Amino acid sequence: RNEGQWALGHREPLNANEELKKAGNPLDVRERIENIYAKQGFDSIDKTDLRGRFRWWGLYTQREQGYDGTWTGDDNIDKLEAKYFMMRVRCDGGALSAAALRTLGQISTEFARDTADISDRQNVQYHWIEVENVPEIWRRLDDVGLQTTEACGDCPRVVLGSPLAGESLDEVLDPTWAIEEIVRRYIGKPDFADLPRKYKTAISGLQDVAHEINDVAFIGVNHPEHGPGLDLWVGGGLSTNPMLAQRVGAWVPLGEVPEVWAAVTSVFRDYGYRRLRAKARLKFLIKDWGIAKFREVLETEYLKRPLIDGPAPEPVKHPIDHVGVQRLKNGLNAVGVAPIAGRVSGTILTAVADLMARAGSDRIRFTPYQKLVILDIPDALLDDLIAGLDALGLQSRPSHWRRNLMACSGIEFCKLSFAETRVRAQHLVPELERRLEDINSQLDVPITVNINGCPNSCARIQIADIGFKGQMIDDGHGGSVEGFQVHLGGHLGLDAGFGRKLRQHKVTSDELGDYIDRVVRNFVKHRSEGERFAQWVIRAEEDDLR
Numbered sequence: 362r363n364e365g366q367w368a369l370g371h372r373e374p375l376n377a378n379e380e381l382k383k384a385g386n387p388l389d390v391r392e393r394i395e396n397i398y399a400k401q402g403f404d405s406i407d408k409t410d411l412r413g414r415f416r417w418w419g420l421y422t423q424r425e426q427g428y429d430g431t432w433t434g435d436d437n438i439d440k441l442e443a444k445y446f447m448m449r450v451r452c453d454g455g456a457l458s459a460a461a462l463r464t465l466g467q468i469s470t471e472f473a474r475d476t477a478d479i480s481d482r483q484n485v486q487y488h489w490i491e492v493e494n495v496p497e498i499w500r501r502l503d504d505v506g507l508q509t510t511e512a513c514g515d516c517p518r519v520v521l522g523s524p525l526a527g528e529s530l531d532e533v534l535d536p537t538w539a540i541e542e543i544v545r546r547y548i549g550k551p552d553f554a555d556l557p558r559k560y561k562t563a564i565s566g567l568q569d570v571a572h573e574i575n576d577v578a579f580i581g582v583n584h585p586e587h588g589p590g591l592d593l594w595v596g597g598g599l600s601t602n603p604m605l606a607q608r609v610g611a612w613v614p615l616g617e618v619p620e621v622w623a624a625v626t627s628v629f630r631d632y633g634y635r636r637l638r639a640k641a642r643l644k645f646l647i648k649d650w651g652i653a654k655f656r657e658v659l660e661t662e663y664l665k666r667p668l669i670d671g672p673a674p675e676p677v678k679h680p681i682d683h684v685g686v687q688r689l690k691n692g693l694n695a696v697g698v699a700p701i702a703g704r705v706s707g708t709i710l711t712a713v714a715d716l717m718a719r720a721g722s723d724r725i726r727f728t729p730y731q732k733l734v735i736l737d738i739p740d741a742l743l744d745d746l747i748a749g750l751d752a753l754g755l756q757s758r759p760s761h762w763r764r765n766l767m768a769c770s771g772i773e774f775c776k777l778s779f780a781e782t783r784v785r786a787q788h789l790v791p792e793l794e795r796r797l798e799d800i801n802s803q804l805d806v807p808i809t810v811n812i813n814g815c816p817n818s819c820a821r822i823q824i825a826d827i828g829f830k831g832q833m834i835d836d837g838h839g840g841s842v843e844g845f846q847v848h849l850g851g852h853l854g855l856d857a858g859f860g861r862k863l864r865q866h867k868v869t870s871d872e873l874g875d876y877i878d879r880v881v882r883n884f885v886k887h888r889s890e891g892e893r894f895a896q897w898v899i900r901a902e903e904d905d906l907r
């Protein structure tokens with residue numbers, strides 16, 4: 362029925378988005394940036410470059426100051442669009458050298474007003490960036506192996522990796538090689554530069570990469586016959602319409618991973634919907650077809666061969682965030698630290714680089730939970746590193762609250778937010794820490810809290826014990842305020858399922874601490890012994906959850 366699908370011959374633009382991509386490879390702008398725009402400034406920029414083609418280089422326009430949730434909407438673009446950019450650095454597998462981390466630090470301090478926030482896909486993002494500076498940055502970034510290619514846009518985003526790839530005592534294998542090949546073969550090249558939408562990938566020999574909600578995932582497992590390799594998952598995403606990615610039923614040896622990845626991405630390009638902008642993502646195609654039909658098309662049209670059947674690995678009970686100290690195959694140590702919802706700074710990143718040098722380490726990783734871990738810390742030097750990290754506010758022994766909270770960017774910089782999230786979190790974690798110290802003794806089990814500024818679910822609303830979806834609400838009728846809809850009891854891993862939404866429920870941004878306190882105290886009262894939060898949410902009365 363013409364859903365825009367390329368492989369049915371229905372190859373015509375059905376959107377303004379699908380139409381600007383018809384004007385040649387979007388990645389071409391790079392020349393127009395270095396030739397034209399970086400000299401004339403923001404006003405020279407074509408609106409189709411500005412609001413579309415820029416993304417293929419991780420340049421997203423940032424939110425003008427002073428506008429609250431009232432103004433958020435597709436109709437107000439010109440007002441909400443400031444003369445500054447968010448810039449997103451692509452860090453496949455989170456993996457950086459000390460030198461690269463220092464460069465990141467200096468870029469931020471000098472060009473981004475010292476803004477630097479670790480995203481929950483292992484990237485850093487800068488803000489307050491002016492086009493004038495973008496070539497200069499690209500040049501320093503490239504001088505340490507980093508790029509912004511396809512960091513935003515209708516194309517493959519960062520490939521996620523285990524923050525302990527190659528050093529974990531519990532990894533089935535180290536598939537870093539696959540991630541590295543995928544970047545080298547496919548990233549930056551025409552074949553996958555124009556997809557139905559954004560495309561998210563996760564590859565790891567641990568389940569530490571939130572795979573269940575990626576478009577495609579290769580997660581380690583021991584085939585009883587064939588040994589260590591990767592189980593293939595497909596069809597994931599959480600926005601307004603959440604859906605768990607599902608097992609293809611396949612085992613893939615490490616050597617064939619880049620190949621198979623290409624084939625899945627190729628099906629997306631050729632058979633993904635390109636009609637409705639909010640019905641374009643792979644999860645939908647997978648909902649319609651079913652896995653059997655998809656596996657068939659992958660094997661017969663693209664691979665020209667069967668995939669080997671394989672098992673699923675035992676879903677983990679608790680998630681793996683790698684926070685704290687752990688022993689490595691090196692014999693050395695890894696140390697994970699927890700900022701508050703990814704918020705650091707140029708000064709801090711540079712500070713960490715010097716601590717790394719003092720400790721003799723040249724490897725650090727960003728985390729899919731907005732955290733960072735440093736590898737190759739010998740025992741002698743461990744204590745000194747930990748203390749230095751604390752003095753910068755990066756705790757290897759954080760409280761539950763600081764450890765387990767995530768938030769998106771929110772109204773501080775984002776054009777689609779109704780509420781403030783990243784700054785709120787900076788005050789909220791401490792509040793919770795002291796306000797519930799009272800009860801901390803009892804909390805043998807962690808309560809994950811995710812604060813999102815709108816329904817897009819960037820900080821993963823539906824998979825938190827306490828998820829918050831920012832929206833506009835009303836009180837006294839002479840005031841519509843910023844507040845949150847509440848999702849309770851979401852989780853991945855064993856029996857992954859989304860959180861339940863509450864009936865007539867709005868929590869104002871001032872009440873977040875009150876509400877969390879209330880509910881968590883109710884949790885420790887009406888509680889079973891050894892019971893997780895997501896389980897107690899099945900049964901307690903609806904009054905106990907408000």
Ligand code: SRM
Binds near residue numbers: 482597598601777821
């Ligand atoms: C930074 C980050 C949040 C964070 O603090 O971690 C983030 C923030 C933004 N996301 Fe994202 N998303 C981020 C992870 C995600 C995730 C989570 C994930 O991948 O695990 C999701 C949910 C999972 C998913 O994609 O299904 C997510 C779903 C969105 C949405 C919803 C899209 C959709 O499929 O309908 C938008 C909007 C869109 O694409 O149209 C989007 C849009 C955005 C934009 C670019 C807003 C915009 O379009 O103007 C945000 C950046 C604005 C700014 O100035 O900061 N981003 N966003 C994460 C970036 C990681 C990265 O390096 O790529």
Ligand code: SF4
Binds near residue numbers: 770776
């Ligand atoms: S969830 Fe919405 S408000 Fe938060 S960063 Fe993502 S797009 Fe912006």
Ligand SMILES: [Cl-]
Binds near residue numbers: 819
């Ligand atoms: Cl995103």
